[PDB]
């Protein structure tokens with residue numbers, strides 16, 4: 002086929018070593034024009050490239066620029082009519098349009114259907130681009146609303162149904178019987194007495210797992226691309242990832258706060274022993290994020306140095322805490338090995354993936370140069386997308402655990418730092434640790450009790 006000239010169309014230039022590199026062919030690098038062309042190739046459908054592109058394109062192209070590029074890709078100019086056909090059109094007769102029909106059937110219609118397929122995948126899996134930019138959605142609805150054609154009528158309707166469902170879903174069922182909600186000292190409804198030791202450790206780990214599962218499942222892969230969660234626009238590009246990270250920081254600091262602010266040695270042992278029991282139920286539910294929240298708390302500077310406290314921790318709980326720490330040893334080797342074999346539901350730990358993504362961002366160049374021509378390094382984005390795909394494969398499996406609205410709201414409003422900054426609070430926790438257990442030369446003072454309720458744990462065995 003005779004593709005349109007370059008003076009009227011920019012997506013028909015032949016491939017060369019200066020505009021696209023390969024590795025269905027796998028694209029390695031290329032210009033933004035060559036990526037849009039291969040994103041909507043007329044010879045075959047490329048679902049893997051479409052999924053990887055729309056997840057990672059924001060690291061090299063703005064959403065407004067992408068919509069303009071795919072609209073320009075859509076409006077393919079038709080060739081000039083032949084002389085014999087133009088005089089039939091002048092007389093009001095129907096032209097032959099032999100080559101014109103073959104060009105529409107073999108190029109224009111296949112490309113235009115690929116552009117619409119990209120538009121459907123965009124609004125279906127990355128609709129947040131249109132929530133953050135209303136004008137982007139106005140352009141998208143304006144574009145698909147003015148598409149004329151019979152073969153494209155079904156595509157316009159499907160994209161419309163998805164856009165409408167996304168707007169309606171913005172306002173807001175077990176397969177098995179969930180276990181019974183466990184309670185300890187705090188009776189149901191008495192939200193004034195909810196605390197670490199008053200609530201049941203089984204239900205503390207259950208509700209935290211339900212809370213952390215939802216926070217994990219709301220994280221989209223694009224929030225982990227281009228290190229956007231560490232830039233100025235982190236609040237706009239990674240709101241769910243930051244909500245997941247800030248929750249992990251709040252819960253970790255709360256565990257440390259419950260330990261160092263318990264000045265009595267006997268009560269502090271019961272506090273640490275209860276948190277280890279909470280970690281044990283985290284392992285049962287395969288909530289690996291909750292497991293390492295306890296590991297990070299026990300390894301922090303104020304808590305790890307409490308030799309007098311951990312001396313009274315029973316040996317069965319020491320081994321449970323040891324096996325939980327070994328998940329982080331050797332670049333989280335054992336954590337990946339356990340997660341890869343565990344069946345969902347589960348809550349992954351984001352730390353190692355963010356670490357391996359950042360090493361890919363820093364270890365690979367943004368652009369590749371060929372004959373002095375900068376090309377978007379797309380294999381770099383594909384490698385980052387593969388990592389986000391490993392975390393995302395558990396995004397859809399729910400837990401078979403009943404939500405307790407009072408307990409869930411208690412952990413959502415945990416503010417251990419109160420109104421002070423983190424550096425001031427972390428320095429306060431360490432100075433509090435030196436107070437409850439001074440260093441080697443200084444003696445160990447006694448402190449009065451602060452809890453008036455029994456310190457005995459009800460256990461981690463579900464009472465059925």
Ligand SMILES: Cc1c([C@@H](C)Nc2nnc(C)c3ccc(N4CCNCC4)cc23)cccc1C(F)(F)F
Pocket residue numbers: 296299300301305311312314318319320322323326327
């Ligand atoms: C198991 C455990 C733990 C766990 C949570 N901590 C650890 N576990 N294993 C090993 C082999 C560790 C090796 C180094 C290491 N870090 C601490 C932070 N500074 C850098 C070195 C912490 C380890 C903490 C506290 C107490 C206990 C107890 F044995 F008492 F239960």
